[PDB]
A and B are shown apart, each in its own frame.
Chain A
Amino acid sequence: SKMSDVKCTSVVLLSVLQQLRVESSSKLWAQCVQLHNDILLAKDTTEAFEKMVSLLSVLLSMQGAVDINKLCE
């Protein structure tokens, strides 16, 4: 069911990036949109988990946007 868990996590992850005002950067939003739309159309879990590492790396690069040390505890 990871196939479906990965597709559902992609919808929640782009909703978090949209709320952090990433749309205010056209050069960066156009990449997040492409990674999101590719994970939904994917058929192999190895493609979807590699595109999920690229999409999650956007959120981790925004230092101080989310308190990750508090969200992991």
Chain B
Amino acid sequence: ADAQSFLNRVCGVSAARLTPCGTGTSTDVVYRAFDIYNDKVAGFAKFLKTNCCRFQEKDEDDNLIDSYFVVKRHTFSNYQHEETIYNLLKDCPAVAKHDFFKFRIDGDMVPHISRQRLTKYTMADLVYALRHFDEGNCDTLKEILVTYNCCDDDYFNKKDWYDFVENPDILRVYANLGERVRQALLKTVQFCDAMRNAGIVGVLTLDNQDLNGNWYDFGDFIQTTPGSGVPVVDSYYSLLMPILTLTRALTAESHVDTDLTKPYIKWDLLKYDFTEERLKLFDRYFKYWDQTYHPNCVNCLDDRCILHCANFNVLFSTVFPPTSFGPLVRKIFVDGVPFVVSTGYHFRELGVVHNQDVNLHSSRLSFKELLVYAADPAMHAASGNLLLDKRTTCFSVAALTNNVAFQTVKPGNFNKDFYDFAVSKGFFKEGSSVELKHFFFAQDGNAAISDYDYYRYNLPTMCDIRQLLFVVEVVDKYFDCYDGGCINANQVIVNNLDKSAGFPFNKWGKARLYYDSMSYEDQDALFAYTKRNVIPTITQMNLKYAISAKNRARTVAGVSICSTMTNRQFHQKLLKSIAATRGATVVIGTSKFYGGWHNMLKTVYSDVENPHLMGWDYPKCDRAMPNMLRIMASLVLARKHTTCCSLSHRFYRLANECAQVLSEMVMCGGSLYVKPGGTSSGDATTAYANSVFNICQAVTANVNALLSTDGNKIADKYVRNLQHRLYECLYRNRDVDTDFVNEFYAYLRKHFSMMILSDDAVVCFNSTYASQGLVASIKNFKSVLYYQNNVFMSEAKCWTETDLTKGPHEFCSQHTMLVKQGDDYVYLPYPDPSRILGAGCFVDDIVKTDGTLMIERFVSLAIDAYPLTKHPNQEYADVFHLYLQYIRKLHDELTGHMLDMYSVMLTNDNTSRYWEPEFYEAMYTPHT
């Protein structure tokens, strides 16, 4: 009855057609995301709201719209407080309406504050739903994508609609949010100007802005000098940052007068320096960010300043034309003839860089200068034909020859004598648990360019910087165990010199030729030049010929010798220290033999309470990896150079690594293409940079798991204080807190124990904490790889194990078994039987098909097959005995052919030990 008089008062003096969203005089209840920091709780988490009565508008013909009136019951003082603040901030067009009124309930007067024509959801609900994505709980994201016309409600019936790789059209559906978010950004700058000119102080948070962009809830602000108004924004912009690239928000900056209905800006084609445009973009959206921005990173103060300033450059470099980036070239005279050569670079992340040792006139060239000119793509690209290659979406520069090259892949050779032998022993019968699954797959001439096009999956990715600048200090604690620094050419170790030197030297010789042609002072002079100048280089793409279970091709990057020779002299002292250490998190350099597998597992199990095992593998690790995370990996490895390199030397080396193995002119099929980002697998640090990236995503998942947990539900006061201190160090302190970084590293290392080797990891973790949200679980990795790696991680690629007596399901493609060996039990590795039988049946050369030439090839495969003898499945245990029976046959035939050929017996009768188990058992027992 009486509720009608309340409904008529909530309309006010306005024309409105309201309907009640619940019971007529009591409050409504909703679950929403909030950025909160208080004496009792801190985090970015989802909480119940109960202090509001909701009404919704109908239109002029009886249908509902996204326009709500949200009334709230307040105390008396705060009601007046918010009123005072609003009146001063009332004429801002960025502020929502605030109706302060009173009304009788339960027989007495209560004040109310009505906010008019708000959306259903806030900016915090859009930010939370894209960070914390779960494919089984998408109902808030689905309602935002439909309420604002991003897609029809029928779009969600598609197979894998959310997956960036299987449904790449989702990148067009998320980009329809771009103008909505960019209007909210503008309205924040109008509101900050109003707070400053009105003399108001306060923190502004994503939960207090609607999805049109309007601000409300002024009850926590205070008054000051009218010219001393100051808005706090560190958590607002940092939580929002990864959504700005995902929704392509600044895409309206490419158009005339920045209107999506007008044509594109026709930029001057010769223009390479955009420094004043980058500064104009920063004041347009980030005016109150309160930290110095350097458009060109040669001006930065330290690693942390380089990460700060490069994160804004990945946003702004999406406005400028693709032809503006890459080498900057100048005309120079050598013995009177004019060369064209590189005298700088323009980076999407690092800005413009100019070389310090440029000479405009030269009389003669040394061997060191001929190498730099030869490596420089300038002369190769400036003298080649123009290329329009429609087989790919990657940017094509020039064709170096009048013909295109097409490279095919041929099938593997069939070793019929081993297959006929196996079939005689009862192998390959129908319904058997062991069968052929590994083969050599043939490919057509489009093979190469088809594998190179997977670099499409590398999208520009802005990070949360407040989060990344804490994670980078915890990731570094995993590398305090090792020494590092520069070395002379006298001390560099090379594994094999009979390998390709790259382009364009693969036409004159192999790495050995250059290493023999250059004295140690030509090599040290070439290294010292890179600390003051950028050398850009060409990279080949080479197809791979090897056995596989899946039919896709594989390509590897043939990195040039100017790059390979000098990167090896900067990093090798550290990379040799990582491989010499035992018992650490990174397990590069540790053998599986003589007990080493049992030692690695007893180390990851550590002293974890209620422990559980889990693991994962990155999909397209090299393709997807963001440039911000490949830059951070090189900065973490370079921290060892504090004693021998200045701030300026450590920059050019970074710039070099960016110019040579991140952004590159790749040569493929005799033609040049611009690589968009990510790893190149012939890079001297490949396995070691993958391992730093893999720790970073696993540290990030634990920051997100703890800050998204409700702090009122945590029972242990130690973990409430850990969550509270973590929010301050992340989003309110601006310098590193060494005492907390050590405490979070110690917490993490007890409750969440890792073993890591490139893009492969095993974790042993406290399940009681993981089920309460106090440490990461597989849902916290699915979420992080979605907003920070642009990949959907399928549950078909993950695992978890409850019983530690079974060990990890798979690490390095090897299964584990607990077996008795002597007086005690040990963990042993075992391969997939089809990988070992497939390698015997199919080979990559014709001479490998005669077993009498190749007896030692079967001895090596029997060393990997030995642990199968201890398996409960007899069809697996028989695979080792097949190899031992074959090794005997090959020696009987070799002896027969040798006697028929020479009429004299062989004197080396020692072959008899290779067909007995004692030679192989000794490979898996300790004490060598």
A contacts, CB < 8 Å to B = 1, 3-4, 7-8, 11-12, 14-15, 18, 23, 26, 29-30, 32-33, 36-37, 40-41
Contact = CB atoms under 8 A, between A and B. Distances in A.
A7 B551 contact: no
Nearest to B408: A23
Contacts of B414: 8, 11-12, 15
Interface stretch (B23-31, B423-431, B532-540): B423-431
A36 B841 contact: no
A37 B442 CA distance: 7
B410 interface: yes
A30 B439 contact: no
Given A8-B414, A11-B842, A30-B444, 16 more contacts: A3-B435, A4-B436, A7-B439, A11-B412, A11-B439, A11-B440, A14-B411, A15-B410, A15-B411, A18-B411, A26-B445, A29-B408, A29-B444, A29-B445, A33-B408, A37-B441
21 contacts: A1-B429, A4-B428, A7-B436, A7-B439, A8-B416, A8-B419, A11-B411, A11-B440, A11-B842, A15-B410, A23-B408, A26-B406, A26-B444, A30-B445, A32-B442, A33-B408, A37-B441, A37-B442, A37-B551, A40-B439, A40-B441
Nearest to A30: B444
Nearest to A38: B551
The residue in B413, B430, B442, B444 that gathers the most chain A C-beta atoms within 10 A of its C-beta is B442
A15 B442 CA distance: 10
Contacts of A15: 410-411, 413-414
B430 A3 contact: yes
A41 B440 CA distance: 12
A1 B551 contact: no
Nearest to A4: B428
A12 B408 CA distance: 17
Nearest to B447: A33
B238 interface: no
Contacts of A11: 411-412, 414, 439-440, 842
B355 interface: no
Interface string B567-607: 00000000000000000000000000000000000000000
Interface string B392-415: 000000000000001010111110
Interface of B: 406, 408, 410-414, 416, 419, 423, 428-430, 435-436, 439-445, 551, 841-842
B444 A33 contact: yes
Contacts of B419: 8
Nearest to A23: B408
Nearest to A18: B410
Most buried by A among B411, B436, B439: B411
Contacts of B442: 14, 18, 32-33, 36-37
Contacts of B423: 1
B837 to A, nearest CB: 10
A36 B551 contact: no
A6 to B, nearest CB: 11
Which A-B residue pairs are the 4 nearest by beta carbons? A30-B444, A4-B428, A33-B442, A14-B411
B848 to A, nearest CB: 14
B411 A36 contact: yes
Contact of B430 (A1, A18, A36, A40): A1
A17 to B, nearest CB: 9
Contacts of B406: 26
A4 B410 CA distance: 20
A18 B413 CA distance: 12
B551 A33 contact: no
Nearest to B441: A37
Contacts of B841: 8
A54 to B, nearest CB: 15
Contacts of B416: 8
A33 B443 contact: yes
A14 B419 CA distance: 18
A9 to B, nearest CB: 9
A5 B435 CA distance: 12
A44 B429 CA distance: 15
A4 B435 contact: yes
A1 B429 CA distance: 5
B794 to A, nearest CB: 20
B883 to A, nearest CB: 18
A33 B444 CA distance: 7
A15 B441 CA distance: 12
A8 B417 CA distance: 12
B551 A41 contact: yes
A54 B109 CA distance: 89
A41 B412 CA distance: 15
Contacts of B411: 11, 14-15, 18, 36
Interface centre among A4, A7, A37 (most CB of B within 10 A): A4
A36 B412 CA distance: 12
B736 to A, nearest CB: 53
A1 B444 contact: no
Contacts of A30: 444-445
B493 to A, nearest CB: 41
Nearest to B422: A4
A14 B442 CA distance: 9
Given A18-B410, A26-B406, A36-B411, A1 B445 contact: no
A34 B428 CA distance: 25
Contacts of A29: 408, 444-445
Contacts of A18: 410-411, 442
B550 to A, nearest CB: 9
A40 B435 CA distance: 12
Contacts of B435: 3-4
Contacts of B430: 1, 3
A40 B551 CA distance: 9
B584 to A, nearest CB: 41
Nearest to A10: B411
B844 to A, nearest CB: 12
A30 B446 CA distance: 9
B839 to A, nearest CB: 14
B452 to A, nearest CB: 18
A30 B413 CA distance: 20
- Which of A7, A29, A33 is most buried by chain B, counting CB atoms within 10 A of its CB? A33
B11 to A, nearest CB: 67
A48 B792 CA distance: 34
A15 B845 CA distance: 12
B132 to A, nearest CB: 38
Contacts of B413: 15
A60 to B, nearest CB: 19
A47 to B, nearest CB: 16
Nearest to A40: B439
Given A29-B444, A40-B439, A1 B428 contact: yes
